[PDB]
Amino acid sequence: HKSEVAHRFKDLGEENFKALVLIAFAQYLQQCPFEDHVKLVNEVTEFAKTCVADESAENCDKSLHTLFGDKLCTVATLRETYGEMADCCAKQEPERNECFLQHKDDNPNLPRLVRPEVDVMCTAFHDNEETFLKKYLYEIARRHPYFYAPELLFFAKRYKAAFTECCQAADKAACLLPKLDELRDEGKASSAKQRLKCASLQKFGERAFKAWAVARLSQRFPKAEFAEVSKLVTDLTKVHTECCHGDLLECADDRADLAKYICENQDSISSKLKECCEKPLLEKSHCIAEVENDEMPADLPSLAADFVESKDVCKNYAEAKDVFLGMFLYEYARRHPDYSVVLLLRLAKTYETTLEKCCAAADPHECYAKVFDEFKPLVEEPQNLIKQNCELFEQLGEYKFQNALLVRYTKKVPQVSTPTLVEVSRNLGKVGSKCCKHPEAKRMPCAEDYLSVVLNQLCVLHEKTPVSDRVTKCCTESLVNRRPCFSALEVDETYVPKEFNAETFTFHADICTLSEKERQIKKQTALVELVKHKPKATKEQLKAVMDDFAAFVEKCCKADDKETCFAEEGKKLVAASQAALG
Ligand SMILES: COc1cccc2c1cc([N+](=O)[O-])c1c(C(=O)O)cc3c(c12)OCO3
Ligand SMILES: CCCCCCCCCCCCCC(=O)O
Ligand SMILES: CCCCCCCCCCCCCC(=O)O
Ligand SMILES: CCCCCCCCCCCCCC(=O)O
Ligand SMILES: CCCCCCCCCCCCCC(=O)O
Ligand SMILES: CCCCCCCCCCCCCC(=O)O
Ligand SMILES: CCCCCCCCCCCCCC(=O)O
């Protein structure tokens, strides 16, 4: 177009335009005050409007990269605040924008964002909606400078509905806090997959990413032909490679191009895309990414004919090995939306290894005849684990399910910090709660998605503060092998028990007067610390001690004197528990 900024403004709408321009400045100038970015936004928006009225007005034909970089270089404090990033302004485009991109700081060391009281939030929301929500947007954007801006905007708009509904409710906090917790966990998760996907592309290559994408898109678009899936995989690989480089506008163009191709070809891809494809550009590609799987075609034949029985297996494979493995993966995936993507990749890897071994033999068919039997234990292993864990979650409830996991994992890797053991065990309990309510045909994809987020969080914490080599291995192997690796962890035999520290097992009266969540953590903390002190304790000996602590709390809490109970009866529980484990 003659004026990129006019076209963006017309397509997006003023309100969406303003929001994104705020996110984009906040992601680059992460240390500047909210009020400075509001002024930059208003100037850029006023200029955009001059181009909307006349596409030939002065400077309106400059690239949006040029205008954005030009405006970055107007910031008076650029050098004093950002140092060498101010030297980016001495370059011309496209080198200037590349330079700015390299100075985004993924760890800007900003104070934690403190959640105000519910009534303070609802009063701020009422008295000034715009500043209230837009300031928070700026705060999140400047802490998450690679977070895809449109998706950050999609989260922000859902906060409005939450405040509109809950601030007119009778119990405002009971209404509002669960939704804000859900929105925040959803945001942190989306951030987790984004950074996880880019890291995986760098370490394990384009080929491995394409394999993941064949499987995922074949589950999603089972009626599409392989040639069509393969094209989508190529284009999707390009989009993610560009989006991982990190420039908003080049990412957004690639994503919109793919969405428009998908929407122009729905007849050959999926019957479930009509709604997404009538949405505005801003939302189309995100909507398509969340489309539910199309219904699979009826009475599809078994894979045995083309991949085991045919005389031409080895010949078709040898001609173009990755194209044939892709076809095997496409046929298997489209038939099994109930499988994790990584389970499908394990079947593909198994098939490839067998073909590599067997096509060398004189009778390849006899060699690979039973290959589909090799898939049986790979499929049943996750299926059985889901059943086991969903049964225990129902028997125990979320909390006591968390406690069963906490003891299990503390014994397996007792060297992990207690805060991490508590947080990870809790989050794993929440994966059980979420995914065990899905029917069996959607449980493995759910667990794959939410475990990826939890195990990724574990691994980042552990890379930052390494303590266990077994965890470093599970965290550094292929993503296909990460969860089985962790599942294979065994109780640590060579752990020397941590020395007794009395204050660790000293509880005061405040425990009764604490948020139910914080009371769970503190109880979960002493449970880990108990296991860390006596890692050979039995389930019998542990539930016995945990029952004594449960009386110790309920008595000393509803007592005329609470403190003296905690200190005197506290020595009694510790000494009894000490003898009951030593
Ligand atoms: C893209 O993320 C956001 C966009 C827009 C608003 C918010 C938000 C993220 C968060 N947060 O901190 O994760 C919150 C919280 C919270 O959870 O404390 C409390 C709030 C919020 C937001 O708007 C007013 O009150
Ligand atoms: C058509 C392009 C993709 C073809 C992929 C065929 C299968 C590749 C090998 C098996 C999967 C390996 C996955 C991984 O190493 O992470
Ligand atoms: C000075 C303006 C700089 C920022 C401009 C932001 C434009 C973002 C458009 C995003 C469209 C999303 C499309 C898609 O994700 O498929
Ligand atoms: C950056 C990704 C843009 C996505 C555009 C639509 C592509 C097809 C959607 C099917 C699901 C893809 C999920 C994924 O991208 O990991
Ligand atoms: C506590 C987590 C949810 C309950 C069941 C989890 C069982 C292990 C993971 C299932 C499969 C995930 C993906 C995979 O490795 O194929
Ligand atoms: C983060 C605490 C120490 C390490 C814990 C490893 C986590 C293993 C989870 C593997 C997948 C679920 C297994 C299960 O649900 O039984
Ligand atoms: C070394 C002696 C320690 C004795 C005290 C151990 C306290 C463990 C409490 C764990 C409670 C978890 C279950 C519950 O929520 O009641």
- Considering every ligand atom, which ligand is closest to the CA of 498? 7
> Which has the closest alpha carbon to 289: 342, 339, 217?
217
- Considering every ligand atom, which ligand is closest to the CA of 455? 6
Which ligand 7 atom sits nearest the alpha carbon of residue 577? 2
**Architecture label for domain 381-492:** Orthogonal Bundle (1.10)
- Considering every ligand atom, which ligand is closest to the CA of 570? 7
Which ligand 2 atom sits nearest the alpha carbon of residue 349? 10
Probe residue for ligand 1, chosen from 110, 158, 176, 184 as the CB with the greatest number of ligand atoms within 8 Å: 184
536/102 Cα distance (integer angstroms): 50
Probe residue for ligand 5, chosen from 336, 341, 344, 389 as the CB with the greatest number of ligand atoms within 8 Å: 389
Nearest CA to ligand 5 atom 10: 382
Probe residue for ligand 6, chosen from 409, 474, 490 as the CB with the greatest number of ligand atoms within 8 Å: 409
Ligand 5 neighbourhood includes 405 CB (under 6 angstroms): no
Which ligand 2 atom sits nearest the alpha carbon of residue 210? 3
> Which has the closest alpha carbon to 72: 110, 35, 123, 21?
21
Nearest CA to ligand 3 atom 2: 21
Which ligand 1 atom sits nearest the alpha carbon of residue 121? 25
> Which has the closest alpha carbon to 104: 185, 30, 210, 46?
30
- Considering every ligand atom, which ligand is closest to the CA of 154? 1
List CB contacts of 223: < 8 A, sequence separation 6 or more: 269, 270, 271, 294, 296, 297
CATH of domain 295-380: 1.10.246.10
Nearest CA to ligand 3 atom 9: 252
Q: Which residues are annotated as a binding site for Zn(2+)?
A: 65, 245, 247
- Alpha-carbon torsion angle 50, 52, 57, 60, nearest 10: 100
49/21 Cα distance (integer angstroms): 14
124/133 Cα distance (integer angstroms): 9
In the chain the first and final C-alpha atoms are separated, in Å, by: 78
> CATH fold of 106-195, please?
Serum Albumin; Chain A, Domain 1 (1.10.246)
- Considering every ligand atom, which ligand is closest to the CA of 231? 2
C-alpha separations of 273 from 215, 266, 290, 294, 323 in Å: 19, 7, 10, 9, 27
Residues 407 and 542: beta-carbon distance below 8 Å: yes
Enumerate long-range contacts of 373-378, CB under 8 Å, 24 or more apart. 374/350, 375/347, 375/350, 378/343, 378/346, 378/347, 378/350
Ligand 7 neighbourhood includes 406 CB (under 6 angstroms): no
Which ligand 6 atom sits nearest the alpha carbon of residue 424? 1
List CB contacts of 360: < 8 A, sequence separation 6 or more: none
CA of 209 to the centre of ligand 4 (A): 13
> Which has the closest alpha carbon to 404: 388, 419, 380, 384?
388
Nearest CA to ligand 1 atom 13: 184
Resolution (A): 1.9
CA of 265 to the centre of ligand 2 (A): 26
363/313 Cα distance (integer angstroms): 12
Which ligand 2 atom sits nearest the alpha carbon of residue 479? 16
Which ligand 2 atom sits nearest the alpha carbon of residue 480? 16
Helix (H) or strand (E) holding 343: helix 341-358
Ligand 4 neighbourhood includes 239 CB (under 6 angstroms): yes
Enumerate long-range contacts of 104-110, CB under 8 Å, 24 or more apart. 104/27, 104/28, 104/30, 104/145, 104/146, 104/246, 105/30, 105/145, 106/145, 106/146, 108/30, 108/31, 108/142, 108/143, 108/145, 110/30, 110/142, 110/143
Tokens of 502: 């009395």
Nearest CA to ligand 3 atom 15: 252
Ligand 6 neighbourhood includes 483 CB (under 6 angstroms): yes
List CB contacts of 523: < 8 A, sequence separation 6 or more: 549
Probe residue for ligand 4, chosen from 148, 288, 290 as the CB with the greatest number of ligand atoms within 8 Å: 288
Ligand 5 neighbourhood includes 445 CB (under 6 angstroms): no
CATH of domain 203-294: 1.10.246.10
Nearest CA to ligand 7 atom 3: 574
> CATH fold of 3-105, please?
Serum Albumin; Chain A, Domain 1 (1.10.246)
Q: Backbone dihedral region of 246: left (phi > 0), alpha (psi from -120 to 50 degrees) or beta?
A: left
Method: X-ray
SS3 181: helix
Please name the residue that has the structure tokens 């009063």: 123
Helical residues (DSSP H) of 265-320, grouped into ranges: 274-277, 281-289, 304, 313-319
Which ligand 6 atom sits nearest the alpha carbon of residue 416? 3
377/539 Cα distance (integer angstroms): 30
- Binding-site residues, ligand 2, Cβ < 6 A: 204, 208, 210-211, 214, 230, 233, 322-323, 325-326, 329, 345, 348-349, 352, 478, 480
105/141 Cα distance (integer angstroms): 12
Ligand 7 neighbourhood includes 402 CB (under 6 angstroms): no
Probe residue for ligand 6, chosen from 428, 430, 451, 531 as the CB with the greatest number of ligand atoms within 8 Å: 428
Residues 226 and 334: beta-carbon distance below 8 Å: no
470/191 Cα distance (integer angstroms): 26
List CB contacts of 450: < 8 A, sequence separation 6 or more: 189, 430, 431, 434, 435
Start-end of CATH 1.10.246.10 domains in the chain: 3-105, 106-195, 203-294, 295-380, 381-492, 493-572
**Architecture label for domain 493-572:** Orthogonal Bundle (1.10)
CA of 212 to the centre of ligand 2 (A): 7
559/553 Cα distance (integer angstroms): 10
Ligand 5 neighbourhood includes 240 CB (under 6 angstroms): no
Phi, psi of 62 (to 5 degrees): -75, 150
Q: Which residues are annotated as a binding site for (4Z,15Z)-bilirubin IXalpha?
A: 238
Give how far the C-alpha of residue 380 lies from the chain's centroid of Cα atoms, to the nearest Å: 26
